[PDB]
RNA sequence: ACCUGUUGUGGUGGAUGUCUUGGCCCAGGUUCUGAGGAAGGACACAGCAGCCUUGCGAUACGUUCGGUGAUACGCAGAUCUUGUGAUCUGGACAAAGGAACAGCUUCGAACGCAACUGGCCAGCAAGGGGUCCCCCCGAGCUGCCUGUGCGCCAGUGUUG
RNA sequence: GUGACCUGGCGCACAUGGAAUGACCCACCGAACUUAAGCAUAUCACUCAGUGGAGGAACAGCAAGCAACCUCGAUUGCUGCAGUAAUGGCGAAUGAACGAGCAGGACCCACGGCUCUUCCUGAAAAUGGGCUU
RNA sequence: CUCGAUCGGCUUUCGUUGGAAUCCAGCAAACCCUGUGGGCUAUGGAGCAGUUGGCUGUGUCUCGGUGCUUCCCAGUACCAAGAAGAGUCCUGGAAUGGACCCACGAAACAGGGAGACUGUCCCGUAUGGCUGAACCGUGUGCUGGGAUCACUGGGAUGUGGCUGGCUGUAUCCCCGAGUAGAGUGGCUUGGGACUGCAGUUUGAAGAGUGACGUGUAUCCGUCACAAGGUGGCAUACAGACCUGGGACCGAUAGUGCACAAGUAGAGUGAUCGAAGGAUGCAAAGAACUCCGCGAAGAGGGUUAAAAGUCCCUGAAGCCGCAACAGGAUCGGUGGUGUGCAGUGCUGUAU
RNA sequence: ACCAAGGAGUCUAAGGAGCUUGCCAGUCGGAUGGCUUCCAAAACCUUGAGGCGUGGUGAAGGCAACUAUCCUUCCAGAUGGGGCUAGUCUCUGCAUGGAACGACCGGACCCGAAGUCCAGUGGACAGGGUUUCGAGUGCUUGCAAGGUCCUUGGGACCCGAAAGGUGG
RNA sequence: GGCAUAGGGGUGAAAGGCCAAUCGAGCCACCUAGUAGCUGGUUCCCUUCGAAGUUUCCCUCAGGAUAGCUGGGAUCCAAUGAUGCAA
RNA sequence: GGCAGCCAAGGCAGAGCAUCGUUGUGUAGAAAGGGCAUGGACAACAGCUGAUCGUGUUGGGAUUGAUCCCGGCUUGAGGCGUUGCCCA
RNA sequence: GCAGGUUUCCACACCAAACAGCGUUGAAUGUGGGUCAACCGACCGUGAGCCAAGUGGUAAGUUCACCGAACAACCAAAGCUGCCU
């Protein structure tokens, strides 16, 4: 017997990934911090958030940058400041980008966000 | 039925032993054996941790000879000591014996002095290997207990004593070479066996013989 | 799980049991048969099949002995596919100081210095996602087998050598033939420590060398 | 299990909470005979 | 032109290959429902909703509170941001404090009697409303078996 | 003087019961297909179906027991006894138990494997009871 | 209302603690003497007589410790989780792929996700932290030292109680009835002149009874003490919930159901009961133009690609069309040996 | 009619006869017991009763395989030894098959119970003969695992009745 | 229109008629994958060996067991050619 | 089946190598005769794959045969294969 | 107007989705409407019949028995009325 919760079952893990709620998709859609942030806060990865800057680092938009404007946790997507695309008609829409591709350039730093940074920064 | 020489089947599976769609079946598969081994071990050590500073089994069992003529010589453990063994050891209160960890069995008696002496000396090596903790932690302290026997209470895995079978496996040990005795030279053991077996068969005959003898004595 | 009856003769269909009832596609369709769709298989697998196998202890111990002899013969270690390029000797013996190893970095340092990290690197490189429907049933990867570290007791070298891909750990107190001859194939690289080596024949209760024909 | 189960679903979710606690760790009563008095006099001094 | 064939191509068709929030199997734990109303069944309830939901009940895809901490999303629409604070989540669910514990139409063991009836416009009745009366609405009580207690009794049962 | 008991009733109050649950359990009830190359006792089977009742387990359980021994010492489960003893148109077939080895003999049970009644004692186990606080 | 005891998955349950305000009672609440309650529990007991031990609020004055809080001094801790999205280049729609010299982690190479094949992209894993629950940092907590408080061991000496063993006696100890059993009938069992059970008739002993696997009578022996009851453990567990796994199946398989499946549908009903998975990396879900009533169609676009909401791929069977080759004859399909056209392949000297 | 996908000697208890492997008068012992993030319900270990085998025979009461240098006998016969010789003699005698036994163990007969003896209730064996039987012995041919072909009970290679029963 | 009679049962001016297109025993679920000495099917290649429809017994005559023929595994033995010359 | 005149070959002792001889039908049935092929476990191939897997389709080659290999095209991975052995 | 149907009734849009063995129409499709009771009926009882109750039967639930103010029982079923209060 293996203990509870720490199971490497493909079917269970995939079920969890595809039926996660929004408070769990918040942490599944985490992104990596830049080296500036990483040295400054001694924290390596955070959940991505609206209103913070990212660099795409992967995909057909690699090397582009911009502020996050929408976390579409239902689609596991992230919409960025100016990564847009015209529809068949002239309507400009947003491209979803999985936040594992992007790295984080700035943070918004709310109260709970600063508290999270401090709590993860104190080395133990 | 075979077109050969194979024995008569004698199969004994005529009564829906098979878990099919229509039947529940009479099959029990012991796939739990592996996991249950570990589970039994875990609950056994939980028993130890629960009744910690005491034998993991816990009551001293007596040693009794196995029952029939086939297992006469094999000894084993009993259920509890006889009150005669307790009184001989020095215990006259069965409930106190039980509370200090000696098992009692009033159903049992000693049909012989050997069992009495054996289990008496068993209880006497107990009660000397035994360190009683005192009630309320600081009152009177018994003899032999040295005030660090209480500091170091060690839970032994097996009860000091040898194996249960090692009491018949010692009576079954021949002597050294010896000289014969003249009765062992004259005695016919087969004749003795046949005599004591013909004895139980000639009983009514050995009454009719006396009756005829005394009738002829009258005449 | 059906109330299927056979229609019998006098009807222009086969005589298989068919679904009773009507008003749906399932009605009239054949049921209760390996040949039928939705019908039971032939000889449904029972759970009281013999899954385990019984080998006498003498024969299992002989298998262990022979697997060790083949590990000692190096024209079979390379045949099974180990790189004996940097391997100084076979069998490989190692000082007992490695049983006090705490880091996988020190484990790989040792394995490099002795000449088995070539095998470890081969395993790590050739690690792949398992071919053919094994990756669906919780067997994701097909990992090859590198060196086997046989220690004398429960020690830190287990956690040391644990993460290294091909390496397996074992103890002379209980030598696993599934590790001494994986796949049934013989001649696996074993890297015994010194006390494990010294206790090998004591544990296996080998008193003599066998007089084998040549 | 084919209807609302508008009470048994709740008692089963409660049982599930209990079961996935006891799977983590066996239960330990917060207040027992050995801590009632301590907790109570602590409460008393703290509120007085 | 028709037929037969062989290629190329286009249709009809859904075989194959690969996978899978599914099943099946084994092991471990629990078994935790109900007259304080269960399991089931109805009828309701969403700005745009029919179905489904181990959603929910006139407080009706939800209420209080806790954990989390900026979404949710198929459209729109005002609320929401270093915050009584979006969303998701937790048995209406944590508080160690005997602090705290909302609500839950209707049939159903189904409980005033019935019922293919929302009938008897049931009996009693706290209250609310329209004008002492009276009128309308009306919470709540009224099921059986059994147990104990209380009240009233029955007997040409035994007695005083 | 208009009672005291006994035995029945009606109303009220406070409570149990009721119903549900594709596994396991307890009590009953209870087939036939099948097998016997037919078939009737036998077999399937003291099973399926049916009725009632649960619990987390149920049932059993510290001997009106086993044995014949150098005795044992609750019950239960496993190994094995054992396809044996025995039953059976002595056909088809059916078929235990004890010895013995184990698990258990910590725990939410226990007067730590017993006790009620019998038996002994006995002014009901002794400063009335009830409702609120 | 206090006081005590008990409980914590908790918010209680119990008590002859005591008190106040009251009501029944009045030889004294009400059940109960047709018996509530105590003693014993058959390898023993009770009475009585005597001894030897221990548990307990102890009145009282001694001594030490542990700590509930508070105050000081000093130190420590407060929780996460490593390693190249490396400088580059190439292919690619997208690098986890490939190339160049150099990089690193591993107690973590279990898994899963991400635009393709990752140890170093994300969640996680191993490990760590908790589990006095607080998982928190101008607020705390822990330890150690010191102090106050909170609480409990060791000695006085009247107790209030108890209670174990041992010796002796002259005294005595009463064990479950329509029961067990038997005749008979029927089921049951391996149980066989009947293992057990049940009806009915009969029906004990208790100065004994039951069992001792061949019915009976006569002797003897062993074991146990029925006709009342409690009673945990090892044990079973195809459902339903919480988990961990698998040499299992992979959409005609695996549950009837991978999906709005016990659904659609059928039957008056009891019941029966299906078919049904996949766009793409991202909806970027096809703008605009011509024609048409319009759907379509022809362009023109998205996209790596139409992969076009019928959407991964798209087999066979069957069909349309074009090209080419033939076309009366079981004089057939197929085989055989050549030939003639069309069409490949292999080798190829100087 | 056509094509596609499915589609029928399977698993289990006991057993038979070969074959393979290990051990040997033993063998096996995974009921259970000791150990050690997942792997691991694995592997390892001899605490192991016991299973099978070492003895058979009789209905049973029961009884129980002779042989003191070694060795049952005979016929055929595998090897090998010592002489000898291209003639060719002796000794060894396995396995297997057949026969025998003046052998023996147990059972059944007949004539007897003579004779010896004592753990002495008169009991224990003992002798000689037979057209005698045994799944008997004569230098123990065993155990365990795997594998192949099979047998019987099971759905039993797959499909297939008219029927019988229980409840609605 | 209401109500009553239910399956070995109902009902019938009797046809064994009728009881939901069902009746010399309705239908529905289960035992049940009932049993079938009978019918049908039983999935790759090559190489080699290769039959019987006859005996006896059987409630036996469409089937079995039993010999025979047919395959395989063997054991003890037997049997089993071949130097161009020159060196 | 190395203790061989030498090279070449063979070199897995139920294999292989050399020479010679015999014999080739077959229903039921069999083979401890030999192989092709499918799903998956344990191992090996430092196997292949976005410089395009698998499927499928069409040609070619190999094979006594079961069947195997390759080119073209489709297609694009939510990959595949070869050898030993084991479970079906 | 019954039973049955259950929105098919009405209007508009709409027939290039499909159905109507056509299709500027329809019981189709989509949207939105419509059914007013002291006097018409259920409801009130009663009939054939049934249930509970009472009691009984069964190993036991029951689609177990009895329905008996013509007609039962093993049965304490008059809970209402007048005056006084």
């Amino acid at each position: 017997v293996n203990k509870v919760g720490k199971s490497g079952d493909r079917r269970k893990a995939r079920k969890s990934y595809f039926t996660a709620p929004s408070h769990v998709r918040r942490v599944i859609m985490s992104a990596r911090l830049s080296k500036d942030l990483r040295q400054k806060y001694k924290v390596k990865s955070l959940p991505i958030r609206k209103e913070d800057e990212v660099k795409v680092k992967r995909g057909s938009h690699k090397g582009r940058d911009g502020k996050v404007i929408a976390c579409y946790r239902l689609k596991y997507a992230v919409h960025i400041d100016k990564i847009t695309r015209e529809k068949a008609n002239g309507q400009t829409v947003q491209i979803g980008i999985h936040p594992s591709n992007v790295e984080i350039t700035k943070l918004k730093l709310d109260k709970d966000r600063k508290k999270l940074l401090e709590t993860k920064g104190r080395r133990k | 039925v075979k077109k050969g020489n194979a024995p008569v089947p004698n199969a004994h599976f005529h009564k829906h032993w098979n878990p099919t769609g229509s039947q529940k079946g009479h099959v029990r598969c012991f796939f739990k054996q592996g996991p249950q081994k570990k589970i039994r071990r875990a609950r056994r050590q939980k028993k130890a941790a629960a009744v910690f500073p005491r034998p993991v089994k816990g009551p001293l069992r007596p040693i009794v000879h196995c029952k029939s003529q086939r297992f006469n010589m094999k000894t084993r453990l009993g259920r509890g000591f006889t009150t005669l063994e307790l009184k001989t050891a020095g215990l006259t209160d069965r409930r106190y014996a039980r509370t200090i960890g000696i098992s009692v069995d009033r159903r049992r008696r000693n049909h012989c002095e050997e069992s009495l002496a054996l289990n008496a000396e068993r209880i006497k090596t107990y009660l000397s290997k035994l360190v009683l903790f005192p009630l309320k932690a600081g009152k009177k302290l018994p003899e032999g207990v040295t005030e660090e026997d209480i500091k170091n209470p060690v839970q032994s895995k097996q009860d000091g004593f040898p194996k249960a079978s090692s009491y018949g496996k010692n009576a079954l040990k021949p002597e050294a070479p010896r000289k014969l005795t003249d009765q062992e030279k004259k005695r016919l053991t087969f004749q003795f066996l046949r005599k004591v077996q013909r004895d139980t068969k000639m009983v009514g005959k050995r009454i009719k013989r006396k009756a005829k003898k005394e009738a002829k004595a009258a005449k | 799980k059906h109330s299927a009856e056979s229609w019998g003769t006098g009807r222009a269909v086969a005589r298989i049991p068919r679904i009773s009832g009507g008003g749906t596609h399932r009605s009239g369709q054949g049921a209760f048969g390996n040949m039928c769709r939705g019908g039971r298989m032939f000889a449904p697998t029972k759970v009281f099949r013999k899954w385990h196998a019984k080998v006498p202890r003498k024969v299992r111990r002989l298998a262990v002995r022979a697997a060790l002899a083949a590990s000692a013969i190096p024209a079979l270690v390379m045949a099974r596919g180990h790189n004996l390029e940097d391997v100084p000797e076979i069998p490989l013996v190692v000082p007992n100081s490695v049983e006090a190893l705490e880091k996988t970095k020190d484990a790989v340092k040792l394995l490099k210095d002795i000449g088995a990290y070539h095998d470890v690197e081969k395993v790590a490189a050739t690690k792949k996602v398992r071919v053919g429907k094994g990756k669906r049933r919780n067997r994701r990867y097909c990992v090859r087998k590198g060196p086997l570290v046989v220690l004398s007791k429960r020690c830190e070298a287990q956690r040391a050598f644990r993460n290294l891909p091909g390496v397996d750990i074992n103890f002379v107190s209980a030598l696993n033939l599934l590790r001494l001859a994986p796949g049934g194939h013989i001649g696996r690289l074993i890297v015994f420590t010194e006390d494990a080596f010294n206790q090998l024949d004591k544990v296996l209760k080998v008193d003599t060398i066998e007089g084998l024909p040549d | 299990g084919t209807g609302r189960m508008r009470h048994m679903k709740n008692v089963l979710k409660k049982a599930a909470v209990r079961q996935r606690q006891d799977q983590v760790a066996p239960h330990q009563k917060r207040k027992t005979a050995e801590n009632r008095k301590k907790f109570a006099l602590s409460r008393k001094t703290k509120l007085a």
Side-chain angles (χ1 to χ4, degrees):
Chain A
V1 181
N2 180 18
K3 74 182 287 188
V4 53
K6 293 182 312 191
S7 171
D9 192 341
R10 173 170 181 84
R11 184 185 163 178
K12 299 183 189 170
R14 183 181 284 269
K15 174 73 166 291
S16 299
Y17 179 84
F18 287 133
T19 55
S22 72
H23 78 275
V24 185
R25 283 160 187 250
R26 177 188 151 279
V27 77
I28 288 183
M29 295 167 47
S30 66
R32 190 195 191 84
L33 264 52
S34 177
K35 288 194 177 65
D36 277 6
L37 275 60
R38 197 180 186 184
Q39 177 272 352
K40 179 183 182 317
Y41 298 112
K42 303 178 296 296
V43 63
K44 172 185 191 161
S45 307
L46 275 72
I48 211 169
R49 189 192 198 277
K50 187 177 53 191
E51 299 291 325
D52 58 28
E53 282 82 340
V54 293
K55 189 174 198 60
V56 184
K57 290 279 303 163
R58 271 312 172 278
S60 160
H61 297 278
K62 50 193 312 179
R64 280 185 66 131
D65 62 334
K67 187 196 69 90
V68 178
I69 68 174
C71 289
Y72 207 114
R73 299 182 191 165
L74 193 64
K75 295 172 174 189
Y76 285 105
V78 160
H79 301 173
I80 307 192
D81 196 341
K82 61 184 181 294
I83 300 196
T84 51
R85 187 186 190 282
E86 285 150 26
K87 215 190 285 186
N89 38 1
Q91 175 176 357
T92 47
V93 309
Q94 285 292 338
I95 297 94
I97 291 180
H98 194 266
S100 67
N101 305 340
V102 299
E103 87 172 357
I104 304 183
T105 299
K106 279 179 49 188
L107 264 62
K108 185 179 185 293
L109 296 189
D110 289 330
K111 166 180 272 192
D112 280 359
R113 173 56 66 90
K114 295 189 313 171
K115 201 170 176 176
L116 171 71
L117 283 183
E118 279 206 6
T119 305
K120 301 177 71 86
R122 48 193 59 160
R123 274 83 61 198
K124 219 192 275 207
Chain B
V1 307
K2 196 266 178 184
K3 317 177 68 167
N5 205 354
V8 168
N10 167 71
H12 270 90
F13 285 95
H14 286 78
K15 47 166 71 173
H16 294 189
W17 67 278
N18 187 73
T20 190
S22 46
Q23 301 302 327
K24 296 260 207 63
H26 303 343
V27 166
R28 194 181 309 285
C29 298
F30 292 110
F31 299 133
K32 66 183 179 66
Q33 177 185 5
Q36 285 296 325
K37 191 181 173 188
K38 291 184 47 173
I39 289 172
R40 269 194 312 272
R41 206 181 158 222
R43 74 175 50 155
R44 212 178 295 128
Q45 84 171 337
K46 210 163 185 301
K47 157 184 216 190
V51 52
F52 155 56
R54 304 188 185 76
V56 191
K57 301 190 171 30
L60 188 76
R61 312 274 160 166
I63 280 161
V64 309
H65 282 246
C66 290
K67 265 167 87 160
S68 181
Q69 172 259 325
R70 166 166 184 177
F71 314 98
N72 272 336
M73 68 301 289
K74 315 298 216 156
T75 60
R76 56 163 170 102
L77 291 190
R79 200 205 202 264
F81 294 96
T82 65
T83 180
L84 183 48
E85 285 153 16
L86 258 56
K87 189 185 68 65
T88 318
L91 300 167
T92 68
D93 197 354
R94 41 167 276 259
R95 297 202 151 112
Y96 172 79
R98 193 56 193 84
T99 53
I100 74 176
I102 291 166
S103 65
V104 182
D105 199 36
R106 288 172 292 165
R107 292 196 277 272
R108 214 167 66 76
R109 77 159 152 110
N110 311 101
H111 309 65
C112 68
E113 196 278 347
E114 281 77 357
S115 71
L116 177 54
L118 175 68
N119 298 288
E121 60 92 21
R122 199 164 157 86
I123 300 163
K124 288 208 206 67
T125 68
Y126 204 80
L127 275 174
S128 65
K129 272 75 177 168
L130 176 69
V131 166
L132 286 172
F133 286 63
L135 280 175
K136 207 151 61 64
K139 305 196 311 308
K140 302 180 181 70
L141 188 147
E143 297 295 331
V145 189
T146 185
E147 186 72 27
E148 62 263 11
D149 300 320
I150 298 180
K151 303 307 163 291
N152 263 266
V154 299
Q155 186 176 58
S156 61
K157 301 292 99 178
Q158 192 172 4
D159 55 346
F161 292 93
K163 198 194 181 331
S165 303
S166 176
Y167 295 70
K169 280 164 196 161
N170 304 342
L172 282 188
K173 266 166 191 155
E175 41 183 290
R178 82 181 189 220
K179 307 306 182 192
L180 267 193
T181 313
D182 189 18
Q183 70 173 358
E184 307 178 34
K185 296 180 178 180
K186 207 176 72 63
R187 266 180 165 197
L188 313 172
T189 59
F190 176 78
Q191 185 194 229
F192 167 79
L193 289 166
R194 291 312 265 146
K195 188 246 171 183
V196 302
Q197 275 181 337
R198 186 59 46 198
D199 280 6
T200 63
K201 299 296 182 164
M202 307 271 299
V203 180
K205 297 207 169 175
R206 292 184 194 171
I207 309 171
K208 301 202 208 78
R209 265 212 289 102
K210 298 162 52 67
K212 289 175 71 175
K213 286 176 204 181
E214 295 298 326
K216 191 183 251 165
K219 187 266 183 181
Chain C
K1 299 157 199 193
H2 287 273
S3 63
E5 183 65 27
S6 178
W7 285 4
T9 52
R11 326 191 52 164
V13 288
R15 295 182 306 188
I16 186 81
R18 314 196 165 263
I19 304 288
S20 315
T24 174
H25 272 304
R26 200 67 210 256
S27 50
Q29 305 201 352
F32 296 174
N34 51 2
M35 69 271 279
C36 296
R37 172 206 197 256
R40 60 159 160 82
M41 48 170 295
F42 156 70
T45 46
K46 296 290 168 147
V47 76
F48 52 90
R49 155 192 276 159
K50 282 194 52 194
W51 307 96
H52 294 43
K54 200 172 318 199
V55 195
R57 311 173 204 158
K58 266 142 180 158
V59 194
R60 308 199 288 255
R61 289 191 289 251
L62 201 151
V64 163
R65 267 172 280 156
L68 282 181
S71 175
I73 280 188
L76 310 175
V77 180
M78 73 88 62
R80 191 191 169 278
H82 299 274
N83 218 21
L84 309 194
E85 294 276 327
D86 304 353
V87 171
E89 267 206 356
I90 289 291
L92 267 169
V93 184
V94 158
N96 291 315
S97 182
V98 304
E99 290 185 356
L101 274 183
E102 302 280 3
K103 307 305 280 298
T104 300
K105 69 185 301 193
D106 302 338
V108 54
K109 173 172 71 80
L110 165 76
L111 279 179
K112 282 173 181 168
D113 276 339
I114 60 185
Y117 199 51
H118 287 208
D119 293 332
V120 184
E121 291 155 332
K122 166 174 97 205
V123 171
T126 54
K127 187 185 166 167
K128 67 196 180 47
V129 162
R130 187 183 289 260
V131 193
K133 203 151 72 182
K135 57 188 163 321
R136 324 215 266 163
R137 303 175 186 175
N138 301 337
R139 310 174 285 265
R140 193 52 186 177
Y141 297 101
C142 185
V143 186
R144 313 211 199 177
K145 291 206 108 178
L148 175 81
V149 188
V150 167
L151 315 162
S152 64
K153 51 201 154 292
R154 196 138 172 99
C155 60
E156 311 269 13
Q158 322 187 10
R159 320 184 181 119
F161 293 70
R162 208 198 288 152
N163 206 41
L164 291 173
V167 192
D168 308 278
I169 301 279
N170 216 355
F171 319 110
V172 290
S173 44
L175 272 171
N176 197 353
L177 184 79
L178 304 191
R179 302 293 193 261
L180 301 173
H185 309 144
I186 219 164
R188 197 195 171 172
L189 196 147
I190 318 183
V191 63
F192 297 100
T193 80
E194 176 185 357
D195 283 331
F197 203 58
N198 295 344
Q199 297 165 11
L200 269 175
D201 58 356
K202 177 65 175 66
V203 167
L204 292 167
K205 310 198 78 61
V206 173
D207 292 330
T208 53
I209 67 183
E210 325 175 350
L212 299 159
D214 189 39
Chain D
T2 75
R4 290 182 61 145
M5 283 182 101
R6 82 177 100 187
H7 162 82
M8 271 292 309
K9 86 185 178 77
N10 290 326
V11 311
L12 265 187
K13 272 176 88 89
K14 161 194 195 145
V17 171
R18 168 176 291 189
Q19 280 275 268
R20 78 169 54 107
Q21 288 174 7
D22 290 339
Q23 278 173 4
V24 158
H27 189 58
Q28 296 301 339
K29 302 182 278 205
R30 272 199 73 166
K31 279 194 180 173
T32 60
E34 296 76 1
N35 45 15
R36 292 169 191 171
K37 271 168 139 71
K38 172 251 183 182
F39 275 107
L41 65 87
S42 307
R43 172 98 197 171
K44 181 255 283 180
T45 66
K46 276 173 51 67
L47 62 86

